[PDB]
Each structure stands twice: as structure tokens, then as C-alpha cells.
Symmetry: D2
Subunit: 375 residues, 4 copies
């Protein structure tokens, strides 16, 4: 019976036609547009959007693909296959910016921003973390004023803020009894600045601040349909879901390169991949990627059924980032060449962010036992 | 949203209603019948399993079988090995190594004669392949004469039915399957995990009629199909033992105090619990997918190497980790899984199978 | 090229004194001639084996010749454990208890009267001893010693005590009322009136029990004069753990050698198992980890003799060597895709657990680096 | 009770001689004054040489320190503690160039070349690996060498070239030859150190350019054996640096109002780092002592090179993963170091063959 080593459990037959088509467009884009680059740009967002690869889960009313969370996962996978930096562009734009505008925003808000964000003509950022640390009891405040709000505070380490047109900012809103509310800020607004931050960590990325020096907005700039940490965390959860898929694509790329390198490199008149030690490693890569894909797929399906719980995402994010990083390192060690080293460097960064390996462990730990072990 | 830590990915909602019933049935049996035995080798236990309807669950209702999925076969293995691997081992042999070749490769006569007795558990089978192949079957007037000795055969000393593989001279020395019965002349089966017995199959010119050969299979493909199905069952079964270990380690950690805090309130303990949950959840989705592929008629043996190698390894790691968490049933499971990781076949052999399927080069020698 | 012994990669043999090598050969002869025939035939308590070890001179090797002890180094003590656990952990456990938990405190903390009375019999193995610290509940110890006219009266219950039911000599730790409830050591004997040692319900050559003291009255000379506080018993434990760090290397080596020899004898595809890359890599790890473990235990042994041992050192070798040894026995077990490997592997699981777990020793080391306790 | 130094658990300090401790402290001061500002150049060879850190095991007759192999290791450790590139400079210069000149060379070859290599006024490189095809034809009054070596560390800045070639008339036996920068057929195009080729287009040398006291792979292998030994010591230095950084970082960053290093998970990792580093140090130390006793066997080097490179790389990786600049640098360095001079698996198969008598390479 037929066995596809590159697709052990036949993912291909678990996908809809739309999912396969949308992945194909993602793969063509990655090979034709992303790959030549790897062998930060606002035009690259516009290219991604025009390819229809931004906010794929959003309604056609905004020029989106109206696709499943599974399809979103497939897209991340095809893109991070090229580079995690490119996948990161999509995590921010789609899960951190368009999702909260769509899910928590008004129809006026949906109509103004989403079409521009989907196309990549508008660039967005997500302002939650503040200079203090990872400490949430945030200091950014939104004072109620005649006809709206006045925002004061600083967001720090914000992805794409120095090139953002759209700012989704979380702040304790006076007038909501200090509840955390989401606000949409635009680039030209008075007292709003997004300075870049120094230092070299991923490709195609830029980090900066959001400085709000008494930024005045009307009342329709607040996101009406959400309150509390539930809001930003919903975004983070969806980003992590996409990441759990993306790292599988980079993992695969390392696996395929490790395999091909071992077929191409000869020693004692046989390919390296003709030896047990080498084959054993290829077998472990194949296995872990196959397990990871089935888990993320399952989570995507639950997403679409509306039965996703954030703890599920902790499992696939922690497992897949861990396993993908291990695969990238093993692939690296099997050589001695560049692309495998690049994915590996990327995955070290990816494994760190959006909750560390150990933090997701303790989240799952608390969910099993009812006891928190964070402190 | 609701989260079930014991079923993170909601396996319960991926199963058919038929699958849910058979699992509930398997769960009731393991609890009402198996667990008391282990907590307080038997031909009567076969009859009990058969009477509970848990043997050859994938077989047609024509033989008194459940006519269920390969997924349902896995769920049964999982509920049974949850008590002990020995009880699951009984099923592996009977269902996948004995009933499967008789049904899949056999004639209507052979199906009608043997399967009902095997399904009910009134009849016991064994699988004769491995030797100390040299076993040969000479063509004789009106049938065959079998000579040779099979070794390390599960349940052979208590078996009524013998599925024996032999090079048939009447075919171009090709590997054929033959059904031998306990009362036959040249046939003897000397004895050599819980509820298990191994022995030999000694054939001193055992003469059988022409109706005793399985007509519809030839070559190593025949016995291999049986092993593959047994390995599929095992990949599901070890997850049940894995779960039992995970659940016990969790509960022990809630019950046992150290420094006026439960063990399970500590980071090191929780990380280990998180790993258990993760690997079992990954292993289940994998076995489930392979099971679904079985039913679609799309199983490739290399798929089984993936889930068998992975789930046996990860299940062994979990049982080992759970054992170490009992510092100061888990010992039973942990010891059992060490045996299970070893047989049909080892971790490294399945790795080299996958290695060869990826590269086109065999690395066994 | 230059000579290489795969069986001894770093030439331990040239790091040992002649006396250390002689006592090891002695331990090795005892293990093969007396212990090895036993493991090949289990759940039987046999008090005479203590006498056999003692007569072979393997009990209290670090102790003075005045008691008939070998007056050997702590390195030699380690070598003996290794030669002994190589056969079975239970037999090494006999010596840990007898030498480090019973003879060490009587010798180190006891009077000359106590040294003279108890040590010679314990060295020869005519007396069996046990060590009483742990209670069902070590600072909030409930076992107490009331001051009474002419001595002490001990009452309380010790739990999980090795060899207590076959023991003649009892080293018991208790809160002494007359010493403002400070923890003191007492030597109790088998015949005393309120003393019993019931076996507990449910390793080889090991027997566990309680020490029940129902008002056991002893004279004033039964207390260990030269020690107070937990420093005392903790000092005995540390020496036992040092011995284990060596011992597990013996069981690990036994597994390493059996996995190697099995791979040479068993053929597959008309080639030896040990001719394949995967099998040899496993052999490579065993050799590597055993050789590191030995240099570590040896160094600590040398620091013991210089009087420069610190307990954290022992946490390092005990945790590492128990862990690495268990992994070797497991890998050896799994490579036998049979009886002796399986026996060692089961033993090392228990050994890894007792006398401080892997995680416990990590947090001891963690605390020693950071000054922050992470236990609770 | 007795004192415990978590930074030095088995008291390495008390296992070293006075000379070894002094040479270590001198190496440490050098690395700190000179190397550390750089990580935060042909002249750098001269600086190292003036510090007396090149060819540390060699006789004082060449201006060398005449120290032990333990000291050589200690120096590598202090140097790689800053950066692996700088240790690699010493590995080549000391073990791949000066050693074969000293061990396999004529007295004339020693007197001519060694003082300059010791001082760092001369730079050497080691020519064995190719893209054996390099040959040395017998010619009237000497030899003619033809071929190209690739991935040779420091070849484009080298004054001295130790090249191995199949020498016709020996017959095609591997012999060692000393080549100089100014020579006719010699060119070294480039491809914290620098690699290039050694292109030999019929380079003609006299009969005194051959290393007389060696033949066969024993020659080049003795050199690699010594470099790898140095490496097994050096990576322990990058490893410690990562460990100390991980610890100090865990003490400095608070989370949930407690330092990270106050948690069990963080502490377990520190215990693993501490433990593996202590084991690696005791091993490399034992091997150094065996070198000095003249009892080194190459399989010993396989054990420590493979183990310490593997274990240091894991420590570096774990340290990086714990930083939720210098740790990232070491980690990238150690991955290359674990790759070169024999991979982990090759040393496993080297040890495997020595146990079984069976080769599993093919």
C-alpha cells in the first residue's frame, strides 16, 4: 500500500479543497516571493495581503478568504517554512491586530480598518506589554474626556510599532471602573509616537515603543465588545495557535534539508543517510512532525467548532516549538548548511516568546491539579 | 471554554457512537472482570472476553463479531491494557494473529468453521511463524504433510487452533498458511507478562486435507499483515497503561504531602505531569489517525512503525517517570511496558524501517 | 600505538594505592565466590551473610585495626561497594548500613567503652546493627529520652529501618529532655526490655522494620557523648551516600559488560549485534558515563581522606552516578531485545529513589549556588 | 562543616601544581585584558606569543613555557572562556604546527621555525584536509609538492605551512613537509579566525623540508589528538562562562516578585550545568596527567572530546533557553566546535570499535 514518507499520516486527505487551495497559494507565494529574499519591508505586507494571505479567517465582507483556522495554520506553516520572521509578520497583523478589531470592534471599526489590514496596505501593531517587565496591572490609562478618551502611557517591545498605521492599545479605562479596554489609535494622532528600539532578533522584523502623551480619541475608538485580560489574551492565544503550525513548517524544512544533505553527501561510497545513526535521526524528525501536525490540526478543528480552550493551545505551542527546535538542532549537528542554521537560530527565539516552555508546562500543571506553581 | 485535562483534545467527540459503546463495554469489562483479578494463565478468561464480545471486534456479525472499526479495536486494547498488558496480549494474538489470517486469507468453509468458536472465546488460537523459515509442507495425495518446529509461540500450549506458516513445496516453495487443530496426529505444543504462556509447535509429518491451506494469500505478506494489525493494537494499548500511570502519578501527587505542601504543587512535579498529558494526547491522535486510515483501506505498514515505536517508547518513558515520582500498579505497568517495547519489533528496528522508507537504502546490514 | 584498555579507559588501576588495589581484589574474590552464586538462586532473610562479609573483612574497612577493621581509605571503602553492588545492590546496602550508619557513629561519636564493646563484633559481623532516625511523621522528631535516675528512658517509634528486625545493636536518635530536647544518639541492644523491631508489611538481602521503644531504660553510658544535633546522623548518611555513588558504578559496569558480551555473542543478519552503529553508540555512552562517574567518586573519596569533604559534593556524585547508572541498566535492558541485567535495572530504580531523590539533590545544589531554597 | 565552593565543587584548585595555577592565572589575565574587550588580526598572534601562551608544553630552548599538558588545557579553558575563536588560534599554532615540527622534525627544523612560532612573530597553518591527492614528487636535490588543501585555518596569513602529502618513493607514504610563505608554487586564497586554501602548483622544496621522524597517518593524527585534547578543556571554559552567566542572570531577573533562580526548574538546570562541568573537568584533568606520564591513548581523547563538546554545547543551549549576548555567542561557537575535529558520532564509532573489535563506519 502507498506510503508517502513526506506525509506519513496523509494530512492531504484530512483537508478540504479550500484548505488545500489556500495552502497552495501560500506555498506559491513563499517559493516565488519569500524564498528569493532569504537566498523589514512595508511593501512585503502589501504583497502578502494581495496574495490573500493576511487574515484568512475573516469574512469576505472585508476582502478576506473567509477560511478555517486549519487554513490559517496551513498558511503559517508554508510561510515559516521559508522563515519565522515572515510568519511573525502574519501572527501580528492577523491574530494580534485584525482579530481583536473584528471580534471586539464595532461595525464602523470593522469597515474602516479591516479591508486595509487584509490587503497589507495598512500595517498594525499590538500594544500590551509595558516597559516595567512582564509584570497584568498595567499603567497605561484612558481618562474619560468630553466626547471620548485621553490615553497616557508607554508600551514597550511592540512588534511593528515604528511602521504601524493602526494601533490596538490595551489600557485601564477610568470610567469603566479601571477595567482593561482596547482602543484603536491611528499613526497621525497628536501625542502618539512609535520610536524604534536599538539592537539587532528575527528577519523582516522591527521593534519599537508606543508613546501616548495625552492622545485624544472619540468614543468610537474604544473596542466595545470586550473587557478585561480576556481581550488581549484571546489574541495571544490565536497567535500561539498559528506559531504551533509555523514551527512545523520550519521543522519540516530542516528535516527535508537534513535528508537531502545526507543523500547528497557520500562517505565510504555510500550516502550518510545510508547509515543507522543518520536514519534514526530522520525517523525521529518524521515522527515528531507527524505527531505535531495531528495535534495542531485537531486544535484548528476545535477552533472552528468553537470548542478551543487556551490550555489546548499551551500543549501544541509548547510541544511543537520544543520538538521543532530539537529537530532544527539535530539537523544542524548532522551537517559539517546555512538555511538549517537560520531556522535553528530562529526557532531558539520562537521557543522563548509567547510563553516559555516551562510557563506552558505550569499552565497545564495548574489545570490538572488546581494548584498554581508559578510562585 | 470548557477544558478537560484528562481528555485535552476531546477524543470523546472524535469517536462514533458505535465506538463509544464498545469502549464503554471494554471499560466495564476491564473494571468488573479484569481489575479484580490483578488486584486480588486462564482458558476461562478467553471465554469471558469472547462472551463480553471483545474478541475480533472488527470481524463481521456473521461470526458473532461486533463488526466495528479498527478505531474501536484500538479503544478496546486501550481499556484492557489499562489494567495489564497481559490481558491486551491475549487479544492481540486471538484477534489479529489468529482470527485475522483465518478471515482475511481463508475460504468460506474456514471462516464458518473457526471464527465463531474463536469470537466467542470457546476456541483458542495461536500463531506459528518464528523458528529456533525451515518448516515445509510437502504435497500429499488429497492434501499436505507438514514438518518442522515453531518456537516462542504465544498461547500454543492451550490452543485448539494453530495458524502455521510454511514453505509449501506444491507451490514454488512459497510461504503459505495452514490451519492445524489440537487433535491432529504429528502435532504437539510443549510449554517453554500476566496471563500469558509461550510454547513450541512441533510438527512430525502432520497430514492435513487440501482444505486446510489458506487459499487467498502467499509470501511473507500473509503473516506480516497479522503482525501489523497486532502492532496497531499495541500502539493503542500502551496509551491505556500510560494513562493509568499518569492518572496515578497525578493523584499520588495530590495525596502525598512534603513540606506541608502536596508534591503536585511543585514545579518539577508539574512539568512531568505536563509532559505525560502532552505525549499521551499526541499518541492518541496518531493511533486514531492510523485507525481511521485502516478503515479507509489506506493503511501502509510504515504508519504502524511510527505509532508503535513512538507510543511504546513514550508510554515506557511515562511509566518510568511515574515510578520515579513515587519516591520515599505503576511498578507493574512500568515493568510490563519494558517487555512490550522489546517485542514485535524493537524501537531501533522500526526506526530503520522508517529510515529505509525515507531514503531507499536499508541500514539493517 | 599506545596501550588502551577499553575496560578501564582512564586507568583507575594506576590511581589506586597497592593497599586499595588489594582490598578491591579481596572484595572481588568475595563477590564472585560467595555473593554471585547466591543471586543465581532471593526473598530469604539470612543473618549469616553478615558474618560472611565480616569474616571476609568487608565491614568497616575505614575503621582502625584495633577493632579488626582494615584501616583502609574512603576510596577503598568505595571500591568495596563497587565490587559488591556489581553483584547486587542489596549486598552493598548491607555494608552501607553496617559500616556508615552503625559503625561510623559508634566510632566517631562514641566513648572508648562503646568503641571497645560494639565495634569488634560489628566488624566481624557477629553483631548486626541498625540506624534509627526516620519517623512516620527529622528536626521535629517525636522520639524522646527522658532523664531517669541512673540513665535515660527512651520511648518512641522509628520507621523504615533497615535490618532492624535482625539487629543486635541499635543506634537511635532522640530528643533528650535533659539536653534541652536536643537530638542525641543512644546505643540500644537487642535484649532490652521495652525494645522491639517488627518487620514491615508487603531489594535482595534487605529487611526493613520499625524500632519500637516502649520505655526502654538504659544507663548513662548508652548515650553517644561526642555529638549533638542533626550534624550527627546527617554525617552517617553522607558517608552512606558516598558509598552508593561508587556502588552503582559497579552495577552499571556489570550491565555495560553484559550488554557488550551479549552483543558479541548474538548474531543478526550473520553479523554480531555489537557490529552495528546503534549498538556501539550505546556502548560508547556507557563507557563515557561510567568513566566520568568513577573519576568523580574517586576525587570525593580523596577529599574524604584529606578531611575536606563537603556534603554538596556527595549530592553531586550520588545524584549523577545513580541517575547515569540507572540509564545504563535501562539501555542495557532494552538492548537485550537477560536475567542479571533486568535484576540490576530494577534495583537501581529503587536506589535512585532512596537516600535523597534526584530532584532533592538538585535543589540542594540549586540552594548551594543561589542561596535560595526552592523546596517549599 | 567543611567549606564548599559551588563554582569549584571538587577543588580543581588543589589538584593543580604551582606552575599550572600561575600559567592559568596569567592566561586568565591575558584573556581579560586583551581578548574580552575585542568580543565586546595578525597582531593578536604576537600578543598571545608575548604572553607566553603559545606552545606551552614546549622546551624553554625555543622560548616556550615548558609546562604540562594540564597547563595547556587550563590555558585553552581560560581563552575559550572568552571566545572559541581565540582558543582555535592556539589549537592550530600549538598542536597542529609546533608539535609536529618539534616531535617529527629535524634539529635544524626546530631551531629555525619554533622560536618564531612561540613568539607569534610567525604564523602557522596545518594542511591535511582536501576538497589523499596531494603528492610529493622526488626531484634532484629535494621534492616537488602538488595539490590543494581546503578549509585550512589561518592559511592566508601564515608564514609556516605544515603540509601532509603522499610522497612518491616512500612509496606514496604520507610524509610531512615544511613550506614557507615566500615559496614559488604556493598561494593561499581566503574562502574570530580565518580560513583559506593552500594551493600548491608544483612547489619545489629541498630535501631538508621533509619532517624526517614520522611516516603514515600517525604523524597528522598525533597532531589532531593533541588539538582535540585542548578542545575538550577549552569548551569547559565556554561552558562555565554560560553557566555563571545563567546563574547571575537568574539572580538578577525577578518574576512574580521572586528571582528566577529561586525556582525549582531554574535550579535543576544549574545543578545539571554544575555537575556536567565538574565531571568534564575531572576527565580532561586525568587525560592531561596521562599525557604527561606518556600514557595517552587516542581513545581517551575521543571520550573527553566527544563528551565535553557534547555537554558544553547542551549547557550553552540550556543557558540560551533560560534567557526568556555572550551566552548566544558561545552557543553558536560551540555548535561549530562540536561539528569539527570529528563529530560526536564518529568518536562514538571510534570507541565502539575499540570495545568490540568491529568497525561500524561502513
Amino acid at each position: 500500500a502507498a506510503f508517502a514518507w513526506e506525509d506519513p499520516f496523509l494530512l492531504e486527505e484530512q483537508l478540504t479543497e479550500d484548505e488545500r487551495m489556500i495552502r497552495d497559494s501560500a506555498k506559491a507565494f513563499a517559493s516565488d516571493v519569500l524564498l528569493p529574499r532569504v537566498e523589514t519591508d512595508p511593501e512585503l505586507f502589501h504583497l502578502m495581503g494581495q496574495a490573500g494571505l493576511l487574515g484568512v479567517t475573516l469574512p469576505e465582507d472585508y476582502g478576506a478568504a473567509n477560511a478555517s483556522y486549519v487554513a490559517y495554520g496551513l498558511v503559517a506553516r508554508e510561510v515559516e517554512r521559508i522563515d519565522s520572521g515572515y510568519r511573525s509578520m502574519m501572527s501580528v497583523q492577523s491574530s494580534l491586530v485584525m482579530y481583536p478589531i473584528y471580534a471586539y470592534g464595532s461595525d464602523e471599526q470593522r469597515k474602516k480598518y479591516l479591508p486595509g489590514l487584509v490587503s497589507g496596505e495598512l500595517i498594525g501593531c499590538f500594544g500590551l506589554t509595558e516597559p516595567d517587565a512582564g509584570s497584568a496591572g498595567m499603567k497605561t490609562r484612558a481618562e474619560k474626556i468630553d466626547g471620548g478618551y485621553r490615553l497616557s502611557g508607554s508600551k514597550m517591545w511592540i512588534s511593528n510599532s515604528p511602521i504601524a498605521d493602526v494601533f490596538v492599545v490595551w489600557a485601564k479605562s477610568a470610567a469603566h471602573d479601571n477595567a482593561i479596554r482596547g482602543f484603536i489609535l491611528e499613526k497621525g494622532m497628536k501625542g502618539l509616537s512609535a520610536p524604534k528600539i536599538g539592537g539587532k532578533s528575527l528577519r523582516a522584523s522591527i521593534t519599537g515603543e508606543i508613546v501616548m502623551d495625552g492622545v485624544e480619541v472619540s468614543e468610537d475608538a474604544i473596542l466595545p465588545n470586550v473587557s478585561g485580560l480576556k481581550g488581549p489574551f484571546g489574541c495571544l492565544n490565536r497567535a500561539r495557535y498559528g506559531i504551533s503550525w509555523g514551527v512545523l513548517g520550519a521543522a519540516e524544512d530542516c528535516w527535508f534539508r537534513a535528508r537531502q544533505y545526507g543523500l547528497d553527501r557520500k562517505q565510504f561510497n555510500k550516502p550518510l543517510a545510508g547509515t543507522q545513526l543518520y536514519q534514526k535521526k530522520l525517523a525521529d524528525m518524521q515522527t515528531e512532525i507527524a505527531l505535531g501536525i495531528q495535534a495542531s490540526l485537531r486544535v484548528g478543528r476545535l477552533f472552528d467548532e468553537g470548542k478551543m480552550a487556551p490550555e489546548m493551545i499551551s500543549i501544541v505551542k509548547r510541544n511543537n516549538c520544543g520538538k521543532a527546535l530539537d529537530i532544527a538542532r539535530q539537523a544542524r549537528d548532522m551537517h559539517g548548511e546555512y538555511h538549517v542554521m537560520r531556522h535553528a537560530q530562529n526557532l531558539e527565539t520562537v521557543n522563548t516568546y509567547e510563553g516559555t516552555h516551562d510557563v506552558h508546562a505550569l499552565i497545564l500543571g495548574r489545570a490538572q491539579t488546581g494548584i498554581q506553581a508559578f510562585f
